Ligand binder design. Structure first.
Ligand SMILES: Nc1ccn([C@@H]2O[C@H](COP(=O)(O)OP(=O)(O)OP(=O)(O)O)[C@@H](O)[C@H]2O)c(=O)n1
Ligand SMILES: OC[C@H]1O[C@@](CO)(O[C@H]2O[C@H](CO)[C@@H](O)[C@H](O)[C@H]2O)[C@@H](O)[C@@H]1O
Length: 578
DNA sequence: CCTGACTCC
DNA sequence: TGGGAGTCAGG
């Protein structure tokens, strides 16, 4: 494969259609080096050194010109890496990573070679082959690097049409071009903006937490009558089941279980298990949300810059890494206070948080076309209280807080394919009763039962299931004669259209929201998405408008057979936006 | 490196 | 024997 190793940018490299590689080898691309550039177009194939291309006003103009279309793989990586250099990338019309992800998330495509494999294209090497793995990872000699980048660009160039053609067959071309690609740009902005952190506050919490860990730790040793590593499920298992001779409720492949659910069930036998649960909760707060967070905060700006992986989950959700900002504590007050350290990036700005209320159950209502479930949402009746009246068979006045919590476990459990065994274990109730709850639920919501039957049948017949905006998940195990394997696939068939349609909806909402913010020239911008919620920051003056704009855009992103409902709060910190 | 903790939706 | 994720310490 012939290419030019160019010393300067020329006009023919700046055609209005090109495959473009802007190579960043560090896995975390924030403020990461760009090691090489390749361009393939109608005129030839070119390798450029970054020092050259990125200092060249004409190349930089071309990068930022939206009418000059680029085909890429992982354009968000390149866009953010370029942002850290103050260079804008526009005109990305095809992203091979996102295309491959839509065609089959299970393939785990994460380099051009793996995408190319999908079309039996082999004139390109895997990145790991060129760079090496782990401690061996290195950028090779220029001629080797240059050929690799050029070959990746040529693969993207040749693969665009084949991938677009299959997406069109799957009814997924608009999902790529109107949803995932625009979202990629929005996520790039979110990651690059980052979220500001009050490190003084975290360091203080950390100091206090260290004190408390020491106290809980020593009390646990007193209760155990021995010192041991409480963070070692192995050592803990000996203490609990050999020394204290507590009952063994569950084993894993390696030994005794010490899961939270097991320890809770052991509470009637020894008080030490409650202390241990507390200690493990505190230790995670310290290790992860204090120490781990502080490790990744950029010290001069005090911002953290997560990476949203847009091409990983099997259902169409995002994930968040380094750090994960989608699992910041909220359920326990001690941990929830971590959110006090997430603050606005400017003076006199505020945090604004908006979340869909029960979007999975509303989606289930839509997809199952269950009259009773649809009517509950159409009239905004409390769905957990409704299910309680049904499973316990009482009037609304007789529903206690605990009954509602159990009904809630039923409501979400059904969505995730729970068995009577799993429900009984989660609620710690008789399995006979758990089975009755499930039987009563399906008697009350017969449309949901038909849905579960139908979607498993569809998966068996077609080999995959689909979401509202035509995302797909293949389920080859659905016809397995093996009960365990088939059962897991049946649960995925039931759940994926629900979880995945919910992901589709919030993604479309982010695009519609961005458009409106820019339309109204507001300074407000997105910081985070947490599956069914959106977190923004804005100058305090803009709260009144956002209180109207954000929930309307979210509720109207798609139109279902039941309303969507969005709650919203704002405050001086993420904690206070409650 | 894998497992089993913890955290979120 | 409930769906989808990431990080951490221990081994
Ligand atoms: N028994 C439960 C309860 C909750 N969840 C999970 O935790 C998420 C958040 O649940 P939650 O906030 O409690 O849902 P709500 O319906 O909004 O609860 P509530 O009306 O009481 O505020 C759910 O989407 C689900 O993924 C679960 O798996 N099992
Ligand atoms: O840039 C995100 C993009 O890159 C991939 C590899 O193609 O994931 C890499 O980067 C992630 C973000 O740092 C890492 O978490 C991951 O380990 C690394 O392979 C894709 O998975 C992805 O969407």
């Amino acid at each position: 494969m012939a290419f030019t190793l160019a010393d300067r940018v020329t006009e023919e490299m700046l055609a209005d259609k090109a495959a473009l590689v802007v190579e960043v080898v560090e896995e975390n691309y924030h403020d990461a080096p760009i090691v090489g550039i390749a361009v393939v177009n109608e005129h030839g194939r070119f390798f450029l050194r970054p020092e050259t291309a990125l200092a060249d006003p004409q190349f930089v103009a071309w990068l930022g010109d939206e009418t000059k279309k680029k085909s890429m793989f992982d354009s968000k990586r390149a866009a953010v890496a370029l942002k850290w250099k103050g260079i804008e990338l526009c005109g990305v019309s095809f992203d091979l990573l996102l295309a491959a992800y839509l065609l089959d998330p299970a393939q785990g495509v994460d380099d051009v070679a793996a995408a190319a494999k999908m079309k039996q294209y082999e004139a390109v090497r895997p990145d790991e082959a060129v760079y090496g793995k782990g401690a061996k990872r290195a950028v090779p000699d220029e001629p080797v690097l240059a050929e690799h980048l050029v070959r990746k660009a040529a693969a993207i160039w040749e693969l665009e049409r084949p991938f677009l053609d299959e997406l069109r067959r799957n009814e997924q071309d608009r999902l790529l071009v109107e949803l995932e690609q625009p979202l990629s740009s929005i996520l790039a902005e979110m990651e690059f903006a980052g979220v500001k952190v009050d490190t003084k506050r975290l360091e203080q919490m950390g100091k206090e937490l260290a004190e408390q860990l020491g106290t809980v730790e020593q009390r646990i040793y007193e209760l155990a009558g021995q010192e041991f590593n409480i963070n070692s499920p192995k050592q803990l298992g000996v203490i609990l089941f050999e020394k204290l001779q507590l009952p063994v409720l569950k084993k894993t492949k390696t030994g005794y279980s010490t899961s939270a659910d097991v320890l809770e069930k052991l509470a009637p036998y020894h008080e030490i298990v409650e202390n241990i649960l507390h200690y493990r909760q505190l230790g995670k707060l310290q290790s992860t949300y204090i120490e781990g967070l502080l490790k990744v905060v950029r010290p001069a700006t005090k911002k953290v810059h997560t990476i949203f992986n847009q091409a990983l989950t099997q259902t169409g959700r995002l994930s968040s890494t380094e750090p994960n900002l989608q699992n910041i504590p909220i359920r326990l007050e001690e941990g929830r206070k971590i959110r006090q350290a997430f603050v606005p990036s400017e003076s006199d700005w505020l945090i604004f948080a908006a979340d869909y209320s029960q979007i999975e159950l509303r989606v289930l209502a839509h997809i199952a076309e269950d009259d009773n479930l649809m009517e509950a949402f159409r009239r905004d009746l409390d769905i957990h209280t409704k299910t309680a009246m049904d499973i316990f068979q009482v009037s609304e006045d007789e529903v206690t807080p605990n009954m509602r919590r159990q009904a809630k476990a039923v409501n979400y459990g059904i969505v995730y394919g729970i068995s009577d065994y799993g429900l009984a274990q989660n609620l710690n109730i008789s399995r006979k009763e758990a089975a009755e709850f499930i039987e009563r639920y399906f008697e009350s919501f017969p449309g949901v039962k038909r849905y579960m039957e139908n979607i498993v049948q569809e998966a068996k017949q077609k080999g995959y299931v689909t979401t509202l905006l035509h995302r797909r998940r293949y389920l080859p195990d659905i016809t397995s004669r093996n009960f365990n394997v088939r059962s897991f696939a049946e649960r995925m068939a039931m759940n994926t259209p629900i979880q995945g349609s919910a992901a589709d909806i919030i993604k479309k909402a982010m695009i519609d929201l961005n458009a409106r913010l820019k339309e109204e020239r507001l300074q407000a911008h997105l910081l985070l998405q947490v599956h069914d919620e959106l977190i923004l920051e804005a100058p305090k003056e803009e709260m009144e408008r956002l209180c109207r704009l954000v929930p309307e855009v979210m509720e109207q992103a798609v139109t279902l057979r039941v309303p969507l409902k969005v709650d919203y709060h704002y405050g001086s910190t993420w904690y206070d936006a409650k």
